[PDB]
């Protein structure tokens, strides 16, 4: 009939505080402060799954720009050339070539330069 | 239909009673109604009105900086009233007479279909000795058994009183819960006929 909340409530609070591990001050010790931090960190994490894809693409495009300008092309002209010559290598792989396989990246840039003119 | 008797030959019983379909939702309602009918319902708590003291306002409504309080027996307070304090109430549901009989018919038909009904020509013990009843039920190979007789014998009642998993009931005393709980339902031929008159 009478239901004590102590055991269930302790399990709830401990799950939140375990998620607040590593947080500063009351954000890792105090439940009603840690609860807000765990929710906000979750809001950030959801939003940063989207932002990670943007951040990495901006990083690939910048490295492709640097790599292609070493080969006499800007990023915009290289992408247009990679569409004129039907090359579907994506920017993640292109940015890996521009750093790690520079001879392979030079061959692709020359293939884009030839396609443009 | 035909109900086999351990001693004598098979007898003919009513299809309505011993061969109907199993209405599980109706049997469930009768079992739930029967268990609700056995509750004492005897408890209470105290509301804010019934807890000792608490007539005076603990402090003035404005100025002290505290949250406003009307009584120290507010259910918000430690030692105060129970918000919705229980009072002794009855838990018995109403079961229609025919609803009860239909559940009994379902239980009896299902007991026959599950081989959990044992029919014997008669069941009497001579002396009120538990050892005698144990010997009788061991010949029939029964350990957890409800014994249903047309008239509960005085010696039979005494002999089964201390037995661990044995219950002796009159036909009128065979509730839906005991017909389902016990592993077997040993029933005399007289009680089978008395069942037929009641439920058919």
């Amino acid at each position: 009939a009478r239901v004590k909340r102590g055991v269930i409530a302790r399990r709830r609070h401990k799950k939140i505080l375990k998620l607040a591990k590593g947080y500063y001050g009351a954000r890792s010790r105090v439940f009603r402060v840690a609860k807000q931090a765990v929710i906000k960190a979750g809001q950030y994490a959801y939003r940063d799954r989207r932002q990670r894809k943007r951040q990495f693409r901006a990083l690939w495009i910048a490295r492709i720009n640097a790599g292609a300008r070493q080969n006499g092309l800007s990023y915009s002209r290289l992408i247009a050339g990679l569409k004129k010559a039907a090359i579907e290598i994506d920017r993640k792989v292109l940015a890996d070539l521009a750093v790690n396989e520079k001879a392979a990246f030079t061959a692709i840039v020359e293939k884009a330069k030839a396609s443009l003119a | 239909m035909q109900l086999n008797v351990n001693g004598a030959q098979a007898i003919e019983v009513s299809e309505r009673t011993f061969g109907g379909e199993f209405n599980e939702t109706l049997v469930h309602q009768a079992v739930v109604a029967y268990m609700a009918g056995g509750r004492q319902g005897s408890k209470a708590q105290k509301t804010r009105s019934e807890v000792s003291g608490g007539g005076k306002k603990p402090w003035r409504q404005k100025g002290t900086g505290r949250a406003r309080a009307g009584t120290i027996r507010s259910p918000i307070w430690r030692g105060g009233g129970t918000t919705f304090a229980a009072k002794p109430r009855s838990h018995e549901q109403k079961l229609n007479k025919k609803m009860y009989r239909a559940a009994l018919r379902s239980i009896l038909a299902e007991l026959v279909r599950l081989d959990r009904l044992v029919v014997v020509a008669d069941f009497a013990v001579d002396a009120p000795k538990t050892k005698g009843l144990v010997a009788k039920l061991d010949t029939l190979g029964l350990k957890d058994v409800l014994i249903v007789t047309d008239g509960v014998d005085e010696n039979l009642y005494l002999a089964a009183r201390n037995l661990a998993h044995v219950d002796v009931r009159d036909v009128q005393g065979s509730d839906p819960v005991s017909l389902i709980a016990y592993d077997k339902v040993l029933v005399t031929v007289s009680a089978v006929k008395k069942f037929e008159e009641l439920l058919g």
Binding site: - | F22, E24, T25, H28, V31, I107, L111, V177, I180, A181
Partner: protein, 144 residues
């Protein structure tokens, strides 16, 4: 069949609403009561017939009629109910024995509703033209 193997049919029994038990329940923090106003308050109920202070319908309209005290001892017995009487004679006391009229009923009238199964005698009981024809068609008769 077992005590731990018994269910009611799907939809026979349901959980009750439990308001104010968190966000996920769908009834948290107001209990479906909205935000403010009388209807949200504890004990907040609008009286039956209350129209906001406008003249209520139960007072715009006039009182009419009177109740009939003479009609409190009367009952109507259908022709389909005459066959359920015992003893082939339909009377005031015989209709009470059959539980077709109440004990306080002092005058009975029969009207055509259903078929008179068997020939019966109506003793001290009035009938309509259609009921009288149907009763006499089945072989019945009337006595003062």
């Amino acid at each position: 069949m077992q005590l731990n193997d018994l269910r009611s049919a799907p939809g026979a029994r349901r959980e009750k609403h439990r308001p104010g038990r968190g966000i996920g329940s769908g009834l948290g923090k107001t209990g479906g009561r909205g935000h403010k106003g009388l209807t949200s308050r504890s004990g907040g109920k609008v009286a039956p017939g209350f129209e906001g202070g406008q003249q209520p319908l139960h007072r715009r309209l006039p009182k009419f009629g009177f109740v009939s005290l003479k009609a409190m001892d009367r009952a109507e017995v259908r022709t389909s109910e005459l066959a359920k009487v015992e003893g082939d004679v339909v009377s005031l006391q015989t209709l009470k024995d059959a539980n077709l009229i109440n004990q306080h009923v002092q005058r009975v009238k029969v009207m055509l509703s259903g078929e008179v199964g068997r020939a019966v005698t109506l003793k001290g009981i009035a009938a309509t033209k259609g009921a009288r024809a149907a009763i006499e068609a089945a072989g019945g008769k009337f006595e003062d």
